[PDB]
Structure 1
């Protein structure tokens, strides 16, 4: 327990830390020597220790300025070590901050030199911030540089240099060179995988040598654009603390031939010099696109040079390469072979919790009004990647500015600060901004998590048990299958009337095994067949493999029954290894046009008929829909359920929606001429009078005959 708890300090001394004698006793520290306190994100400082019997054992006294410099908060744990190599400073260069000297001119360096460094011997280190009082101001300066290294102490004979110009304060904050794990949310799994793939090769290279293996080098993270790939890479690099080096695809590809090779070679050589190091790339597809479409010689030479540099990498060297690409298959396949980028990571759109975390992170500096319900925004915002959330916050702030603008006059060059103090973003502003958003990730196949349970499924208990036995057991109990030798089936196909709850069944199955659902509608297959769509089925299955376990869903699978797409699907499904936790669920209302090859063994062989909901199922479905709309007390739904023979889930939902619309219209009329914020009997009466069925009886008979034929 050398770690000590961070404690708030009333005193403003920037180099004095007061601790009890037992604090020294724990580490056997001796009075009269400074101590090194190290926090987080490679942040450390040196403080002169004083004995304060008042403080209880383990209690420290550090001003807020030092904690702010260390990038730490109260109540944290910081490692304390002695200072055996105490050294004095011979030449220290320090420059001021212009915004800190506002209101008073002149050179305060001479004013502060003697009084502040009168044999004080205050320990100093690179990047520290120290505050000194001059006249009526308390001006803070930064430790630009110190010699001899590394930290040293400010001796009286030390020569202090001030030849230079001030620098901005927020510039360092916006440099983006300091971003920890705290600046990311919703990516616990991917972040953990990247940490496991990066920290161990660099932090603990001895493990691989002990076990006798060459550590991996090629990590490739791909996902939808604007999902935070660059931010995650920067965060992991800074958290590791190793030397960093970035290469931009657009930058490298923008220079005339030959210069690109020099840039790449210099980057690799320089990174090797500073081992351990990490090399990052952006839009690797841009510099090494799909060779099948671009035959230019420049890209060929660039990609060949990159491959040569990768392959020639020495066996033992703490260097890890990271690449980013939107389309996993866009890059030239030669990069995916062994000894190169092989550790593939897929980043999907965050779920509700991830969106809430991202919104929390971004909304850390805006003047949020008192009435903010970020939970509601997280629940409502579906399909928003982080970039869209940042844009949403910016737009809401802009709307607030619009509303508040009328008070001020924009012609004048100065705006009163009293109005500025009144700036505040209300929930209505966020509502409007969400109204004026434009999500795009959902338009392409992207893996997303689902949280649908069996409860939402209104009945079909036997189908539930059959599907459980088919899917859950091989995913959680492969040992029994291995013992018996039976391989697990993967191909399951639902057939039945439309709107009978097939998508919900697939989502529930995916949720049960805690897998990443993937959806692919029939129009997507058609567009892929025509080639207009970007992603191909190969890409879909590659993403599914990389994100395993996953459940792929092919809706309206008959829409392609076209033959090229069917053949490609057959080939890819055959190539899939059974032992992998990949499952495919097909849906179609016409189980006759599907090619027989689709039903062959090792493919979509399992067939499940989905019948129309029963009366109990109808009642359960009605209860499920009626969860947020208030209902008249004493209302009875049994009459509706019994009078709705042959209905489907979509029909019942439509009935509920039209009844709600009638109730809302009645409320609008009453208000214009909300005492009745719920639905009453008359609305349901009208809805049932306007009731119908989505499926004719002839189709039901056809489905029954087909099911009996399949059974026989």
Structure 2
């Protein structure tokens, strides 16, 4: 109906929009009528309607300036509404753009704007852009202020105040706030959570009045630093169009004694007095740290003031508080109960698709060369949070500049435009930047996503069936468990010789139910045991809960199951709600060494033996690990697999790696002498000659004895 299609207007007028006759009839509009046009990001403008039959029905023509102001592109949809109550601008105060006025002599206003508005009656709104073509020059301007507000018609008698200093252009670009969802990718789930928890309470209050509930107020986003928490909050606030009131932590805590509390009070009062509002308390951990941290009075008064303000806003006011912290345990525990930040959101490192989307978003203004395979970079970059990807792009650009520095004279302050034209990033620059990049997200426990299916694991059909019936059914068919009153199994414990691929089974199980996968290796467990780590078991399980359905994975658990840490783990496992879709998968190589308490019912009770791969499994592993390697045509791996009886997956990977090493050595030698694009069978034969099993026969016999003991324990 009113969703007129956007088109490039032939005319350059800043207050004219051409529409088809059919649409004009549909909306009862007419030529010369002033209407309010709304596009995207809630941007609005006032345009004079003109009939033009060339346009197809339902299409409207607008110029470049109006499209830029509305932040919409050609082919978009704009909603047109009547604007009959627009008054004539009593006084319009406008200043030009500095760059556009360089080299202009005489009075700019008389030269350019004086004929533009006289006998024009152009409706102007604050924050708009209008361009005037005078003589041989074209100058853009800004509608700084309009009286009456917020918009009005510039009549002949309207007084135009052009006095003032030039306005720099860089402000609009380098301050690119009002960023929409189009600048964020790879975090659709958390974005949807924040949207459903913020927009609906504000954009459609009547819903909760009809249902009759008090919508939740607090929201607590947390995750690794540099994952774009601030960007997400800013985007949501801008999309909602509410009275965003960013509050920083360091900014508040740097004030004189007796002033930070006043700033907090004034901020909350301002947000309340202009409802709706979205208070965003960035880096709340600096304002309200953990109790065992700083005990000073100045560090206590601020926390008490924040608690009082939080408890004081519980009313009809439409105020939403969003806080961002690195970890859930860093915040004072008093701020995570009812009436406070009771809803949590967890941000996790993106997957390959997320990294590709981030690369596309950042690398849209770069002068990229043709040889760009962004998919390749996304595949090769693992664990890179958004900040790491931005740094990678910057480093690649800098490397390109360095390479092209040969034709650059540092002493000369002038650079030929031709040289700047030749500038262009290449895949080599990106690979160099990847070589020099330093990711840091993985150094701490972090929620991630895995996409491994029942094809990277060879054999183990019975174990796969057991895992399916243990995990897949509870998540996908909870109704059946409710029907039969059977509580879902919490977790399972894998045991077997190292290298059998337990992590692969865990990742496959996580993928099948579409559950985020949390990993906790031995070093992290020991560091927590010694109390010199930045994360705690309570923190790990809080993140698992907030990111449900999750799958926690404990590796080489025997190192700690030899215990205060084990006590905390038991307490957390007892605490977790049964209905919550959180599964703890433990792995160890010496099952009898595990503390018996961990094996009691209601805990990691189910015990699963992971055997060594079979001949067919060996062949499958060899094929899987060699998928992206050039093999000699006609080569069959059946003989090699047969010769590798009793070899775990790690052994086969070692064999493949040695064969590739021989091949690359031969290729390097041949090139240096100046060939062998693939790997010949002789390389594999040499690798097998240099093979060695990783498990002694005695340990295998011990594992088999333990398995037989377990089977007899359940055999009758």
TM-score in terms of structure 2 length: 0.98
Relative distance call for 1:601 and 1:314 in structure 2 (3 A) is closer
Q: What does residue 244 of structure 1 align with?
A: 244
Q: What does residue 107 of structure 2 align with?
A: 107
SS in structure 1 at match of 2:158: strand
- Please tell me whether the aligned partners of residues 214 and 315 of structure 1 are also in contact (alpha carbons under 8 angstroms): no
- Please tell me whether the aligned partners of residues 283 and 323 of structure 1 are also in contact (alpha carbons under 8 angstroms): yes
Distance (whole Å) between structure 2 residues aligned to residue 56 and residue 511 of structure 1: 49
- Please tell me whether the aligned partners of residues 562 and 593 of structure 2 are also in contact (alpha carbons under 8 angstroms): no
Give how far 1:251 is off.
0.9
Relative distance call for 1:692 and 1:314 in structure 2 (3 A) is closer
Q: How does 1:615-630 map to 2 (within 5 A)?
A: 615-630=615-630
- Please tell me whether the aligned partners of residues 33 and 50 of structure 2 are also in contact (alpha carbons under 8 angstroms): no
Distance (whole Å) between structure 1 residues aligned to residue 374 and residue 310 of structure 2: 46
- Please tell me whether the aligned partners of residues 655 and 691 of structure 1 are also in contact (alpha carbons under 8 angstroms): yes
Distance (whole Å) between structure 2 residues aligned to residue 427 and residue 327 of structure 1: 36
Deviations 1:347-394 (A, max 9, x none): 001111111111111112121112111111111010001111111111
Deviations 1:393-421 (A, max 9, x none): 11111111111112111112222222112
Relative distance call for 1:525 and 1:177 in structure 2 (3 A) is same
Unaligned runs of 5+ in 1: none
SS in structure 2 at match of 1:701: helix
Q: How does 1:384-533 map to 2 (within 5 A)?
A: 384-533=384-533
Q: How does 1:566-645 map to 2 (within 5 A)?
A: 566-645=566-645
Give how far 1:112 is off.
2.5
- Please tell me whether the aligned partners of residues 30 and 49 of structure 2 are also in contact (alpha carbons under 8 angstroms): no
Distance (whole Å) between structure 2 residues aligned to residue 652 and residue 417 of structure 1: 56
SS in structure 1 at match of 2:247: strand
SS in structure 1 at match of 2:246: strand
- Please tell me whether the aligned partners of residues 529 and 562 of structure 1 are also in contact (alpha carbons under 8 angstroms): no
Distance (whole Å) between structure 2 residues aligned to residue 61 and residue 214 of structure 1: 45
Which segment drifts farther, 539-548 or 2-11?
Answer: 2-11
Which segment drifts farther, 11-20 or 700-709?
Answer: 11-20
- Please tell me whether the aligned partners of residues 500 and 613 of structure 2 are also in contact (alpha carbons under 8 angstroms): yes
Unaligned runs of 5+ in 2: none
Which segment drifts farther, 190-199 or 38-47?
Answer: 38-47
Distance (whole Å) between structure 1 residues aligned to residue 256 and residue 59 of structure 2: 61
Relative distance call for 1:103 and 1:496 in structure 2 (3 A) is same
Give how far 1:674 is off.
10
- Please tell me whether the aligned partners of residues 125 and 151 of structure 1 are also in contact (alpha carbons under 8 angstroms): yes
Distance (whole Å) between structure 1 residues aligned to residue 101 and residue 113 of structure 2: 16
Give how far 1:314 is off.
4.3
Distance (whole Å) between structure 1 residues aligned to residue 114 and residue 99 of structure 2: 24
Distance (whole Å) between structure 1 residues aligned to residue 437 and residue 226 of structure 2: 15
Give how far 1:35 is off.
1.4
Give how far 1:584 is off.
0.5
Deviations 1:483-510 (A, max 9, x none): 1111111120011010001000000000
Which segment drifts farther, 515-524 or 419-428?
Answer: 419-428
Q: What does residue 297 of structure 1 align with?
A: 297
Deviations 1:587-631 (A, max 9, x none): 111011111101001011001001111111111111111101111
- Please tell me whether the aligned partners of residues 452 and 511 of structure 2 are also in contact (alpha carbons under 8 angstroms): yes
Deviations 1:283-303 (A, max 9, x none): 111110001232111111111
Which segment drifts farther, 284-293 or 340-349?
Answer: 284-293
Which segment drifts farther, 9-18 or 399-408?
Answer: 9-18
Give how far 1:11 is off.
2.6
Which segment drifts farther, 21-30 or 469-478?
Answer: 21-30
Distance (whole Å) between structure 2 residues aligned to residue 42 and residue 396 of structure 1: 36
- Please tell me whether the aligned partners of residues 548 and 582 of structure 1 are also in contact (alpha carbons under 8 angstroms): yes
Deviations 1:495-550 (A, max 9, x none): 10100010000000000000000000111111001011110111000000000001
Give how far 1:679 is off.
0.7
Which segment drifts farther, 660-669 or 220-229?
Answer: 660-669
Deviations 1:326-348 (A, max 9, x none): 01111010000100001100000
Runs of 4+ in 1 over 6 A off after TM superposition: none
- Please tell me whether the aligned partners of residues 287 and 303 of structure 2 are also in contact (alpha carbons under 8 angstroms): yes
Give how far 1:15 is off.
1.6
SS in structure 1 at match of 2:429: helix
Deviations 1:157-188 (A, max 9, x none): 00000111111112122224321111111110
SS in structure 2 at match of 1:156: coil
Q: What does residue 353 of structure 1 align with?
A: 353
Relative distance call for 1:38 and 1:308 in structure 2 (3 A) is same
Distance (whole Å) between structure 1 residues aligned to residue 32 and residue 633 of structure 2: 78
Alignment size in residue pairs: 712
Q: What does residue 368 of structure 1 align with?
A: 368
SS in structure 2 at match of 1:702: helix
Which segment drifts farther, 428-437 or 359-368?
Answer: 359-368
Give how far 1:106 is off.
2.5
Q: How does 1:66-85 map to 2 (within 5 A)?
A: 66-85=66-85
Output the aligned Cα RMSD: 1.2
SS in structure 2 at match of 1:49: strand
Give how far 1:562 is off.
5.8
- Please tell me whether the aligned partners of residues 9 and 61 of structure 2 are also in contact (alpha carbons under 8 angstroms): yes
Deviations 1:8-60 (A, max 9, x none): 22332222211122111221223331111101112111111111122221121
Give how far 1:218 is off.
0.2
Deviations 1:200-220 (A, max 9, x none): 111111111111111110000
Q: What does residue 544 of structure 2 align with?
A: 544
Which segment drifts farther, 26-35 or 317-326?
Answer: 26-35
- Please tell me whether the aligned partners of residues 500 and 610 of structure 1 are also in contact (alpha carbons under 8 angstroms): yes
SS in structure 1 at match of 2:593: coil
Relative distance call for 1:361 and 1:432 in structure 2 (3 A) is same
Give how far 1:477 is off.
0.5
- Please tell me whether the aligned partners of residues 20 and 56 of structure 1 are also in contact (alpha carbons under 8 angstroms): yes
Which segment drifts farther, 393-402 or 291-300?
Answer: 291-300
- Please tell me whether the aligned partners of residues 100 and 140 of structure 1 are also in contact (alpha carbons under 8 angstroms): yes
- Please tell me whether the aligned partners of residues 383 and 439 of structure 2 are also in contact (alpha carbons under 8 angstroms): yes
